[PDB]
Paper text:
Approximately 2–6% of ALS cases are caused by mutations in the antioxidant enzyme Cu, Zn-superoxide dismutase (SOD1). In contrast, wild-type-like mutants, such as A4V, D90A, G93A, D101G, and D101N, retain most of their physiological activities similar to those of wild-type SOD1. The AFM images, cryo-EM micrographs, and two-dimensional (2D) class average images using RELION3.1 revealed that both G93A and D101N self-assembled amyloid fibrils made of a single protofilament with a left-handed helical twist.
We unambiguously constructed a structural model of G93A fibrils comprising a C-terminal segment (residues 82–153) at 3.09 Å and of D101N fibrils comprising a C-terminal segment (residues 95–153) at 2.92 Å. The G93A fibril core features a very compact and serpentine fold containing four β-strands stabilized by two hydrophobic cavities, whereas the D101N fibril core features a less compact fold and displays a totally different serpentine fold containing four β-strands stabilized by a hydrophobic cavity. The exteriors of the fibril cores of G93A and D101N are mostly hydrophilic, carrying many negatively charged or positively charged residues, whereas the side chains of most hydrophobic residues are located mainly in the interiors of the G93A fibril fold and the D101N fibril fold except that the hydrophobic side chains of Ala95, Val97, Ile99, Ile104, and Leu106 are located in the exterior of D101N fibrils. The hydrophobic side chains of Ile112, Leu117, Val119, Ala123, Leu127, Leu144, Val148, Ile149, Ile151, and Ala152 are located in the interior of the D101N fibril to form a stable hydrophobic core. In sharp contrast, the hydrophilic side chains of Ser107, His110, Glu132, Ser134, Thr137, Asn139, Ser142, Arg143, and Gln153 are located in the interior of the D101N fibril and form a hydrophilic cavity. Importantly, Asp96 and Arg143 form a salt bridge with a distance of 2.7 Å to stabilize the G93A fibril core, whereas Asp132 and Arg143 form a salt bridge with a distance of 2.9 Å to stabilize the D101N fibril core.
Author numbering:
A (entry chain C), B (entry chain B), C (entry chain A): 95 to 153
The structure:
């Protein structure tokens, strides 16, 4: 029960909640990606990663 | 139960909540990404990462 | 129950809440990103990260 924090970065967040009766979403997209290069070295992913997309409802 | 904080950065946040009866969203996008380069080295992701997108409702 | 804070940065926030009966959102976007470079080294993400987007309703 001894914590030692140093030259480091820490971030938290609380709990999000949306409570409704009706949820509607309309979307039109026309020209999103037009030759966008992308590089990645030693990255690792555990959630939802995406380039040039249209989600609709992300959680 | 001894905490030691040093040359470090710490951030928190509380709980967000939206309570409604009706939720509507309209969206038109035309030209978002037009040759945007992107580099990443030793990044790691655990949430929702995206380049050049249209979400609609992000949580 | 001994806390030791030093040459460090700490930030908090309370709880946000929106309570309504009707929630409407209209959006038109035309030209957002036009060759915006982006670099990242040793970053790490746990929430919602995005470049050149149109959210609609972010939480």
């Amino acid at each position: 029960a001894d914590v030692s924090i140093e030259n480091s970065v820490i971030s938290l967040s609380g709990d999000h909640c949306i409570i409704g009766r009706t949820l509607v979403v309309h979307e039109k997209a026309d020209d999103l990606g037009k030759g966008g290069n992308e590089e990645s070295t030693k990255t690792g992913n555990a959630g939802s990663r995406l380039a040039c997309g249209v989600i609709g409802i992300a959680q």
